[PDB]
A paper describes a structure:
We also determined cryo-EM structures of Eσ70 alone and the Eσ70-rpsT P2 promoter RPo for comparison. In Eσ70 without nucleic acids, this channel is occupied by the σ701.1 domain which is ejected upon entry of the downstream duplex DNA. We noted modest changes in clamp positions, but we suspected that conformational heterogeneity of Eσ70 (limiting the resolution of the single particle analysis) likely arose primarily from a continuous distribution of clamp positions that could not be easily classified into distinct conformational states. For Eσ70, three major components (Eigenvectors) of clamp changes were revealed. For component 1, the red and blue particles gave rise to reconstructions that differed in clamp positions by a rotation angle of 2.7° in a direction we call opening/closing. Component two gave rise to clamp positions that differed by a 4.6° rotation about a rotation axis roughly perpendicular to the open/close rotation axis, a conformational change we call twisting.
In Escherichia coli (Eco), the essential primary σ factor, σ70, binds to RNAP to form the σ70-holoenzyme (Eσ70) that is capable of recognizing and initiating at promoters for most genes. Although only half the length of DksA, TraR regulates Eco transcription by binding to the RNAP secondary channel and mimicking the combined effects of ppGpp and DksA. To help understand TraR regulation and principles of the regulation of transcription initiation in general, we used single particle cryo-electron microscopy (cryo-EM) to examine structures of Eσ70 alone, Eσ70 bound to TraR (TraR-Eσ70), and Eσ70 bound to a promoter inhibited by TraR [rpsT P2; Gopalkrishnan et al., 2017].
Author numbering:
A (entry chain J): 248 to 333, 343 to 691
B (entry chain L): 460 to 562
C (entry chain L): 50 to 52, 94 to 100
D (entry chain J): 741 to 888
E (entry chain I): 3 to 1342
The structure:
Amino acid sequence: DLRPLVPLDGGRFATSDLNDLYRRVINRNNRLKRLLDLAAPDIIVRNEKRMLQEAVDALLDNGRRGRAITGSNKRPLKSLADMIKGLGKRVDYSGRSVITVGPYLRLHQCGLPKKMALELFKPFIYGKLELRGLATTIKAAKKMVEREEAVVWDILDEVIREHPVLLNRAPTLHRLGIQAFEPVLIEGKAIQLHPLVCAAYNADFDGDQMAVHVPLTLEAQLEARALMMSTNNILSPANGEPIIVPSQDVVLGLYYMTRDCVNAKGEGMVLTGPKEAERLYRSGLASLHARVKVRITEYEKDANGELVAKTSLKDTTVGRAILWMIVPKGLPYSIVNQALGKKAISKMLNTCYRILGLKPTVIFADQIMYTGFAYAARSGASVGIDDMVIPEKKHEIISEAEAEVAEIQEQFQSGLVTAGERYNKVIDIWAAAND
Amino acid sequence: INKLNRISRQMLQEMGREPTPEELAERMLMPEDKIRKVLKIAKEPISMETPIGDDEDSHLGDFIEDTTLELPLDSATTESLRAATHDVLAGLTAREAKVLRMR
Amino acid sequence: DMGTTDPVRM
Amino acid sequence: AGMRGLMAKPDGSIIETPITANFREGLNVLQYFISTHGARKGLADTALKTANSGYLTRRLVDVAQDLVVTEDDCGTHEGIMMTPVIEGGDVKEPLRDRVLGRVTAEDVLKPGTADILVPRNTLLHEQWCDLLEENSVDAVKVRSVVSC
Amino acid sequence: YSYTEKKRIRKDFGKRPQVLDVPYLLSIQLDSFQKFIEQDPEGQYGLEAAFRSVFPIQSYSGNSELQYVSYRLGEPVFDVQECQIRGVTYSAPLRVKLRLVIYEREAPEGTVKDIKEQEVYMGEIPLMTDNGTFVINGTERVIVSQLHRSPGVFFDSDKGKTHSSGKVLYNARIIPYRGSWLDFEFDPKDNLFVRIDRRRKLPATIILRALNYTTEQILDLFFEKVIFEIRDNKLQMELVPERLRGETASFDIEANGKVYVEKGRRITARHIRQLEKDDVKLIEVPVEYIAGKVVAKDYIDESTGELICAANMELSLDLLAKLSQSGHKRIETLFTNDLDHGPYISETLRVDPTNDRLSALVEIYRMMRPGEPPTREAAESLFENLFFSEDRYDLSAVGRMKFNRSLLREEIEGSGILSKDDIIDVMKKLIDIRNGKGEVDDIDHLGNRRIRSVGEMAENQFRVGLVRVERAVKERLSLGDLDTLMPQDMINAKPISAAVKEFFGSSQLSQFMDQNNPLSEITHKRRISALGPGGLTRERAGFEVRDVHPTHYGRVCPIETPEGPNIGLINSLSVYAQTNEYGFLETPYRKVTDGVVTDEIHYLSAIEEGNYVIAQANSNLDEEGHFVEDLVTCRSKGESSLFSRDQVDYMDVSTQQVVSVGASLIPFLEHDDANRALMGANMQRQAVPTLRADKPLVGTGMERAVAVDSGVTAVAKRGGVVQYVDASRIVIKVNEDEMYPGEAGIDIYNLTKYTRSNQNTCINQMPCVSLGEPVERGDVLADGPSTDLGELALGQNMRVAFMPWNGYNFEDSILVSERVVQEDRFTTIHIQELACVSRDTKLGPEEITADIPNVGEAALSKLDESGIVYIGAEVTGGDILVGKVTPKGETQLTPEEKLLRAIFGEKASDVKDSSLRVPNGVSGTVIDVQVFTRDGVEKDKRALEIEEMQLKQAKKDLSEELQILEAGLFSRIRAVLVAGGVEAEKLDKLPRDRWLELGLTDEEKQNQLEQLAEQYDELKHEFEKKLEAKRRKITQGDDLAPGVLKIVKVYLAVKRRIQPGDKMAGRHGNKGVISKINPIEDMPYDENGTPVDIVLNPLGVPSRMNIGQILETHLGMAAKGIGDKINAMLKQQQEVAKLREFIQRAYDLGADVRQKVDLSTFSDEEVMRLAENLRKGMPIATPVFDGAKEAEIKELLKLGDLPTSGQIRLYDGRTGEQFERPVTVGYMYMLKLNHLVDDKMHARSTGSYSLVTQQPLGGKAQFGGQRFGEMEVWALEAYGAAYTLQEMLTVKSDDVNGRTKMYKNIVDGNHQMEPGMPESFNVLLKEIRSLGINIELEDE
Ligand SMILES: [Mg+2]
Ligand SMILES: [Zn+2]
């Protein structure tokens, strides 16, 4: 059965080529027995032993002899060596999708549309439907679950509860190609995701396809919760610094939210805390960056595990005193004070993780993503064609570096310099004018 | 087979178009329904590695599926039916259970 | 692998 | 905004007359035809690095997968010698980002020294590494894999 | 242009006029297949030139010669629509006409006795539908062109990789057109070689040895001579004064008693000039000055009768004393200089182990065949056959012209075989390119590269079929007797119809047509492959044939190419480039004598550019043709320079001829990067048509020819007046002067309604005129799929507004509000096909009965009594379509189930139904049902009803076709005979049948009346004959594959909306997955109240430089501003004068353009059409590389009343806020691609299985599973996981009992697993124990 003769559709057949090879060797053996019993002359039985030798050594390894090729097609046939000399072992409980963004869920719950979630958890649903008391057997369960009554979505939402799945992208490169999640059922046809984690897959959103598997047993579920869920890999295995740096839009929002203009509306007054700073921004009275003295209260744990307090009057903007309402008690005020680009926002997460632990870093990450999106929305930073100002010095500088090259050309035409030195003068002149 | 090859090659060129599988009978006196069988016999089988470039290099030999396994919701069905009739036959007397279990 | 035998002729 | 540099020609050394226009104004026909060759060269170059990295990870995995971290103490003393790297000029990677995380082997001591500063067999996290950076120790001794 | 572009005049920017209009874009395919089959009484492109190269065949003096006279094609027995419905090849018979004559005894040209002829059938040739698409098996196909190296000679430098010291070697190469190659090369030992094709290498002069050239004439032909004369006084020598140039001075020079050069000083041009001054002729040398020189002539002895010194000897003073002891005083020797004349043939003759012709022929015969014993006759036959006969070596006329070009002869017509003045010229040019004069060529210069499209490939396959027939007929002709045979027994029909049909059907170089757009057909019909039989394959390239080489300018487009695995290989043609006589690409130009400038175009090949200077199209001429700038940017040989205002001989035609077809339609291309312009030119070719395509607002202007030529619009053939429009047909009545003398009637167009295309898209047509409106030749009469009013239109324009909104457009996502999916702007229609077969099983055939076991009445409501679904039944996903039951025996039931079946009841006799059903997800509407059947089974009621309806439709169409045409015929007869002979009301009192009896006195229109009468008579005959043929074509059976009974088909017709995952993208380079579909209130309005529909991402512009889309957004906004101003002006009916003045001021617009049109020649009922059609925004246009500026966008912004900077203030819609920092709104165009989320979502829970190894694999219309390779096993072993890895490749995939043993545990309620053993390891033991090795599993 390893070398079958399975019938195709409608009379024609299909076979592996070992049938023709074994038929050749059996034929030539039988013929040599017939010729050796009748006592023929010697040249005939010598040719017989030689061509039987060729047949056996073409059956054991075809490719180091005359390459015995089949009739009716000029492709060379294969034998046992090329069934060991040789990508994938295909898997049940699979699926694939297109991905979208969905920035309203936390960093450990990807979505799942309903239909893949019903075509993947069908044995769990069959078992719990026949165990609850809404059915007689699995035949009645199969009759119930496919015409889609309205009392199977609750059983699906009770077996989804904390059962992990395993997202995965196709050209897997490094160790964070296989993370693990906990699904939230949702309408639609595309797998949702998170806008932070897509800095680690090297995955754009222009139509790249991910894959969902399912772990089945009990040791597998507990292992995929303890060792590889998506909130115990926030330290890249190459270096120290975390791989959850914000990527595209939220860094622009948190760059616009901590700056300092020279004169904005309502600049000069003195507030009484971060809550009244937020309430003076939302009342449409003072704008979002104007230098204004506020007070703060840091919290320090430089003692033997004890949180000591402090208070002062510091000199900041309204934007940083709005951003201060998110940082937990551990960090000092030397973090939210600067211009807050990208290196600073990697360093803020790094020092929070190296001081407090894991769960303040998780909650700090999700809160910083939500504030980044809300103020990138209410800023409205866009580009028009009247923002790329070409200088007022293009014509004169191009005129100077066009006159000097023509001077060097007429110096070469009179035979005072040579070709290589002229060619190394012109490159020098142009590559200075560029800078 | 060789006779139906030779008179097909001799018939194809003078009447013009193609041998229909019933007018090819009447040059002989065959019973008009054996020619389909003797034409279905006369074809050599397909080698199972003529490749098909389906976004990669693959073969005809792995797309050809299986016909003899039974689906697992038949084994689950019979595994339920075993305990079901064992339960419904545990309520009778000894004589009826013995006559049914050996009948 | 570095760093007259055909049965029709004979 | 400015001029877009100097684009190559297929032998490698560059054309003497560069493109003097930018994208907000109009690239005309000759400067566009010089730019398209460099664009096609770059985009065909970034389609072989993938297969080359795949081959390198293939060989470097098949030579080095048999290790498993299997005891809690080997019991030797020697190791390698750490120092801030110098590429003939100002420094490129200082001692703090090189010694961070690996277990010291012998005692670490000052010039006049008076005593031992850090103990013999301790792991170096940020408190001990700040203690190494403040008192300005030159070279630390440390245990490595190839000496195990 | 009478009423097409008098409707919706496209406003045109751009400042340079053009002389040459765009040619017919599909000229290549049509002219090549027009020359493949045509009657021309000579050779040159025909099938004539294929039959005159095998025929005549004469036997081996058997006195029976076969010859050929003529041939003739036939009529196709099916037209294209019925042939595509059925499935057969659109065919044509090819009936050649041979002739057999027999010669007689003892007479070469004796009078023959046997003259005969009989037409022999052979094969087919598939003809060509008139858009350029073959049809082979029900699917439209296109054959792509090819481009490979030219036959003829060229050399090659090949520096670098050999020996790493600068020791280069120039190898010539003679590549012929059919046969075997030929080589010449060098080596670091500097000795010439000779090499027949790729077998093994041999020393050089063996060909001249075996080809009857001895040593005397070869050393005569290569080198020169100089005279040594020992005239009985001490070694005199007559000397040529240039020979000293390169001669280091080695003796003292004096003659005629005049000293010239002292010894030790190299002789300079002064003393060479003195030698040419006084003509000094006789110089004395030292006696051993022939110490390295060799004499030329054979030298015999004086009286003794021996040999002293022949040619090619090491001439020394001992042999010189043997020489001049007899009286040899005139000696001729060779000339030698190491930098002028290298004698490499001398040393390779010194290492030559052959000396004569027979030994060289045995050497060649032993070389090119291994292990063989030689014979003189066989070696002579082989060497005189392989290089000179006209059946195994055919260097064609193209190679002849190139061979005469690259060796500086003059004549261009010659022989097809190479004689003995070509091998010596190749060796002469090789020696000269080694010594310095004349240098090397290269490849991909496009003067060494050609194009052969269809005709040459079909001719070559027809030739191979011809020689396979002719070998057999020559071998059978030998035993042929006098006359009992006719020439239709010996020549069969199978190999030709195997060869040409397999070549059109399944080769590498004939692929399916991407037919889902007007654009993608016309860019797939003209491509340039470089793969396939005869060129480099997919991995032999290297980065010197993939790259742009700058004679690619204007003949092959640079900025468009498929990307990924084979880049730089499948580039496409320019817009104006043509094909020359031989097959080299060639572009147009304009002749400038400086004249003023001349206006005659002049075509120009690949190499004739390389000696001229050529000016630039982007350089202004001023006022009837003078140049104005005193230095104009030009090019001479690939280099751009600055020349004078004279001496430039050629100027470029117009500024479009660098780009492709599908890449000259991206507007504002002059700003984008080449990378994203490449992505745009690859992403316009995948745009699925929508329900009602509109127009592009900022187009290009090269759109009209692209919509007209790739024929999907029924273009009018004779202009006139429309009679009767309908949803299906169109009747157009011709005028008087464009009419034939008879047969006038009316023209008639039938239109293709709903049909599937090749990619499951939906193609229909609609008429675009009204009753009583004139047309002209070249107008449109039918819009296509994605066509509107003659122009090409793919997507729908809608209001983008760049602002990053709440994170829902994070990386590249878009955000479409619900106004789009409510107003149905992107709704598309698909047409699926579902078949089901009815085979012949062993235990009994299968029926189509509509009574199935194991179902009730819930599914069988939508079935009729015969068993196939209705027309109209809107079926969901999972209902019955065609009931099909199969018989089955050998039941073999069980225990306790048979105990159960001994109580209630039982069924039998018709088991598992393989009746097809609609695959899951579809929600169709079954529009058509077709039933084929095999001849010899009495069909049921549904087939008979289908046949009756088709018969009624055919009779109806032919009756109305002869009912409306004779109406115009009778109106023509009456309107003719009333002129000159009018009767008052005698027209309408006697009937039409007794109307044609009233004749006339002798006039031309009397003969016209008689001609029209006989035309009506012959139409009356042909109607009945055509209906007889039509019913015979309908009522018969069909042919089928062996083992079927009847196929029943259905055509579903889905309608698809736009859901989170349909990939949308603009034109020039910004893809996006659509992300969330918002309600209408939440979108950010502006101050007037209009919402805005799509919110892109403004972080994608300064990273990948495509600055063009911001500027396109501004200009589109200005066009819609002018549109809504004219809409507010027309909403109250005021006048026509305000519209006249306002539209004239809209069309004038400042700077000097070429678009002065309004205000005089237009009527009053034309402005009310043009202002009816411009309320949705005035179109703008832009030539590509000469586009708009900034001031013109500012002007057309100010002609409305909008803010001029471009950016408006834009409120929010959730909180009533104002956005600070105002943002950019506008109007860009958007396609809708086909990578749909209902074509990629997939799942699998438990399905089918394979056979040889039991992996999962779905083949019952269920998905498989995503394969688990080895990079994911490393990325899962890198963790601590091993339970999940053991589970994912031992239980879920490849175990035979373990997976059922686990499925029962899951369905009962105890999660666990058992390991087992995998099937790949359990099959590797048998496939390794079937060798002689042993392998076991020993210990406990
Ligand atoms: Mg991508
Ligand atoms: Zn150790």
